[PDB]
């Protein structure tokens, strides 16, 4: 490779004209509009670009060595928290190490396993996703046992399609290589197609389940009910709104069997309607009477549980950091009260009801999760896992006398803690399982939180992870991760590949809690959203400058990475930041054409985050931010490796194709390589790639960064 040898890329004379509130009518040239399409020309272009990318990566001998390291780092047993079904047996996911999909196990005995004995020694295979297709192409995207434990509904995604299909099987009929070989697949006849952007919500009678489907872009979503032991033609439409075709739907059923809840969403903002229907014992039928409790888009509402007509709801109504309210439905005009009040400086992230009347709450304080147990009277009884530092979730069923916590972070691979209400008061909390890694020692790695100041004076926290031998003396390379949007928190997470990269090169890993995320609630999201979106980039750029300025990383040795909205983040950041701010950039499946994002698949919902390009006022703040339309001819770009999957239906690969073509046109003689790596396996909706393929891709990405920053293997 040398500068100025990029593929021949035709520049059309397509021009789109937009309305600007300040500038009037603005003609915007789109010479790579043709890269929106699926044609022979585009096939030649993607082939040429991918061959050029692979050719450059072939020059790097260290990539093969990293693949060896990363495979070994991933090669360890992994497992979920177990779930007790009403048959008395415990079910959990188990991965041997490098399986592309984890396998659902079932306990041999109707008792909580001693998991130190080993998963195969304490359980048998119930459901193996890997055998859904002989070639491993079929992926289980989600699943749900019935309340009574008799059936197992599971959504399957195929390669090629943009929809999942729900199948149902008896829990006494396992899916494995043995069962497939010995007999017939073993599932029921039920085949519920066109399932998307949803979960499976069983009614508490275990007779059927609620699911969202689309008609045979995606519009006119329907909330439907499927009865077990029937075909999809017999499925009841529970709710649809042809007047608002862009709206989507969710659902929930109360544990007592009394209520059916309907959620309605108009866009990707955290605002939903909430209607409540009373079920009589024969269950969901057509003609459900909806009580319109929340009937305007104003706040977030998610049901926790109910006791009689008193409904407990996690909400951010007049409470940016979230809280728990009660709405008493016995009243004609329902009275709204705070059960657990808003904490000013901690986001209420999750609340589950446990042992019928208690509440387990997860608070996120300075982007670090804290777990508490509350009584029925709203009294904070105790803090659980007080010395834990990372991200946490709850796993339980309301009626049972236990719950679990799944705990992880930058150097906590996976701890599963159990709380048992039946034990003596001092002995209730315990550790069920701790995840054991391979080669790495998590104790060799330190994570700290440091604060830096953005351009506007706002103070922003940032996680810094390093191998403990690495010094903050202005010599280390840095890898800066970000997402920056949609109230998605950039939480701590265990990555054996990242830690392996840090130990190998003595680099550091950085995660600034930039505005746009939901680390500090609604106001933090509002601070990097729509007209304020530029703050997200300023926060992210300031983070990188702070790392160099304060001697965490060496000058020009900050690489940046991000996926999807994180791709937009990195692509916009290289365009906007000063020359030499970054030493490498890796956008993965990113948004980039912010003038046309809303024209493709489910992009129209993201107007909540980016604004509407068709509105003149909003065009005026989108246009200057759009990465595709702000590339210059006078700024040296860092070494860039763009990655996309050609079958990506979430973010059309269009976005990345236009950006790389625009980069290559504007700075053809850039001293650093501007490449795009294009995977041509049409990966289905809600899938990982194969494990070996992930390892290879990781080795490419991290090797490219290593070489771009001039890092050698010791």
């Amino acid at each position: 490779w040398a500068p100025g040898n990029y593929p021949s890329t035709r520049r059309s004379d397509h021009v789109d004209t937009y309305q600007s509130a300040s500038k009037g009518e603005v003609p915007v040239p789109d010479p790579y509009q043709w890269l929106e399409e699926s044609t022979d020309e585009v096939d030649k272009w993607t082939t040429a670009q991918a061959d050029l990318a692979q050719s450059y990566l072939d020059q790097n001998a260290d990539i093969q060595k990293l693949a060896e390291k990363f495979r070994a780092s991933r090669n360890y047993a992994k497992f979920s928290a177990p779930t007790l079904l009403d048959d008395g047996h415990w079910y959990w996911f188990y991965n041997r190490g490098l399986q592309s999909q984890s396998v659902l196990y079932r306990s041999k005995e109707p008792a909580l396993p001693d998991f130190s004995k080993g998963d195969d020694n304490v359980g048998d295979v119930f459901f193996d996703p890997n055998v859904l297709a002989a070639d491993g192409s079929a992926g289980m995207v989600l699943c749900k046992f019935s309340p009574d434990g008799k059936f197992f509904a599971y959504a399957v995604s195929h390669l090629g399609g943009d929809y999942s299909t729900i199948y149902v099987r008896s829990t006494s009929s396992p899916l494995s290589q043995a069962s497939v070989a010995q007999g017939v697949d073993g599932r029921l006849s039920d085949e519920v197609k066109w399932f998307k952007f949803s979960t499976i919500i069983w009614t508490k009678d275990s007779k059927g389940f609620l699911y969202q489907r689309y008609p045979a872009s995606d519009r006119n979503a329907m909330m439907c009910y499927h009865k077990v032991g029937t075909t999809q033609e017999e499925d009841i439409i529970v709710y649809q709104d042809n007047e608002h075709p862009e709206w989507i739907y969710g659902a929930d059923t109360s544990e007592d069997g009394k209520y059916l809840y309907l959620y309605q969403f108009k866009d990707t903002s955290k605002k939903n309607l909430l209607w409540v229907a009373e079920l009589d014992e024969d269950g969901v039928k057509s003609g459900i009477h909806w009580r319109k409790v929340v009937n305007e888009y104003a706040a977030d509402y998610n049901i926790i549980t109910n006791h009689g007509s008193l409904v407990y709801i996690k909400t951010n109504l007049n409470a940016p950091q979230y809280k728990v309210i009660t709405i008493d439905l016995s009243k004609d005009e329902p009275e709204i009260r705070d059960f657990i009040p808003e904490e000013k400086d901690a986001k209420l992230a999750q609340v589950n009801c446990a042992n019928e009347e208690y509440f387990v709450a997860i608070y996120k304080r300075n982007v670090k999760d804290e777990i508490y147990l509350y009584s029925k009277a709203g009294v904070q009884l105790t803090r659980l896992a007080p010395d834990f530092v990372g991200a946490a979730s709850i796993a339980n069923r309301q009626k049972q006398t236990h719950f679990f916590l799944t705990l992880s972070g930058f150097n906590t691979p996976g701890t599963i803690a159990r709380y048992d209400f039946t034990a003596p008061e001092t002995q209730r909390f315990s550790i069920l399982r701790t995840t054991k890694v391979n080669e790495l020692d998590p104790d060799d790695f330190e994570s700290t939180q440091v604060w830096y100041e953005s351009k506007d004076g706002t103070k922003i926290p940032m996680f810094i992870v390093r191998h403990k031998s690495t010094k903050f003396d202005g010599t280390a390379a840095a890898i800066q991760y970000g997402y920056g949007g949609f109230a998605t928190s950039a939480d701590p997470f265990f990555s054996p590949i990242i830690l392996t990269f840090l130990q190998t090169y003595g680099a550091i890993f950085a995660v600034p809690s930039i505005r746009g995320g939901g680390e500090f609630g609604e106001e933090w999201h509002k601070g990097g959203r729509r007209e304020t979106k530029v703050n997200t980039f300023d926060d992210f750029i300031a983070a990188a400058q702070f790392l160099v300025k304060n001697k965490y990383a060496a000058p020009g040795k900050v690489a940046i990475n991000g996926a999807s909205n994180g791709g937009l983040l990195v692509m916009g950041s290289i365009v906007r930041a000063p020359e030499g701010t970054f030493g490498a950039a890796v956008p993965e499946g990113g948004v980039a054409d912010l003038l046309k994002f809303h024209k493709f698949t489910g992009g129209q919902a993201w107007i909540s985050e980016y604004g509407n390009p068709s509105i003149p006022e909003e065009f005026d703040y989108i246009y200057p931010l759009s990465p595709v339309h702000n590339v210059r001819t006078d700024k040296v770009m860092p070494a860039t490796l763009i990655t996309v999957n050609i079958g990506d239906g979430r973010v059309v690969p269009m976005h990345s194709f236009k950006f790389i073509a625009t980069l290559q046109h504007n700075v053809p003689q850039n001293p650093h390589p501007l490449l795009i790596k294009i995977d041509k396996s049409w990966l289905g909706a809600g899938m990982g790639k194969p494990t070996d393929k992930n390892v290879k891709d990781a080795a490419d990405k991290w090797g490219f960064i290593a070489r771009a920053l001039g890092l050698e293997l010791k």
């Binding site: 991933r74 992994k78 497992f79 979920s80 928290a81 779930t83 079910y91 959990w92 996911f93 991965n95 984890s102 995207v141 749900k144 019935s146 949803s198 979960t199 969202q212 989507i248 739907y249 969710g250 959620y263 969403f265 990707t268 955290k270 979730s393 709850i394 796993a395 069923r397 799944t406 992880s408 996976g414 599963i416 995840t435 991760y481 997402y483 949609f486 998605t488 939480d491 990555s495 590949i497 990475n561 991000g562 996926a563 999807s564 909205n565 994180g566 937009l568 993965e588 499946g589 948004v591 489910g602 919902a605 993201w606 979430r650 809600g686 990982g688 992930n694 891709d697 990781a698 990405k701």
Partner: peptide
């Protein structure tokens, strides 16, 4: 589970290194 979060521009159900979601996969299966 978050219905509205399943259609975000995000990697998988926030980074490429989140590849393994086995730890949390058994949290809400019933």
């Amino acid at each position: 589970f978050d219905t509205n979060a399943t259609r975000l521009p995000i990697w998988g159900i926030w980074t490429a290194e989140h590849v393994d979601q086995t730890l949390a996969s058994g949290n809400d299966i019933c």
